[PDB]
Amino acid sequence: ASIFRCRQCGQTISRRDWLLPMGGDHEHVVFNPAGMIFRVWCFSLAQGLRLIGAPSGEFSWFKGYDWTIALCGQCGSHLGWHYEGGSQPQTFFGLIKDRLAEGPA
Ligand SMILES: CC[C@@]1(C)CC(=O)NC1=O
Numbered sequence: 348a349s350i351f352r353c354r355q356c357g358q359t360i361s362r363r364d365w366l367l368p369m370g371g372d373h374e375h376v377v378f379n380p381a382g383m384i385f386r387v388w389c390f391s392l393a394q395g396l397r398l399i400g401a402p403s404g405e406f407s408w409f410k411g412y413d414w415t416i417a418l419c420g421q422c423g424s425h426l427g428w429h430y431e432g433g434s435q436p437q438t439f440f441g442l443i444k445d446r447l448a449e450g451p452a
């Protein structure tokens with residue numbers, strides 16, 4: 348169990364080696380304004396996504412970062428957000444843990 352695939356279609360997305368402990372922890376449990384709870388795992392890098400629209404700072408869970416919605420590039424499933432415009436690191440991915448499947452490389 349070392350790579351993460353899209354749970355809906357199997358697209359390769361990220362790797363356990365790429366987990367990023369933001370604020371001391373790779374896991375952040377957060378809510379959006381519609382009250383949905385997300386268990387977000389932070390990754391330094393991802394692939395196989397499609398980033399939609401232009402970045403926005405509104406309601407950002409991570410201070411100094413602007414977000415863009417990240418869909419699975421294959422099936423369109425909403426897998427998380429790409430973060431940018433911040434510092435150390437400038438960018439990273441916050442991916443929804445229960446929307447990924449973990450398994451061998
Ligand atoms: C509304 C945008 C999202 C869902 C993404 C974020 O970082 N904060 C949020 O609540």
Ligand SMILES: [Zn+2]
Binds near residue numbers: 354358420424
């Ligand atoms: Zn997919």
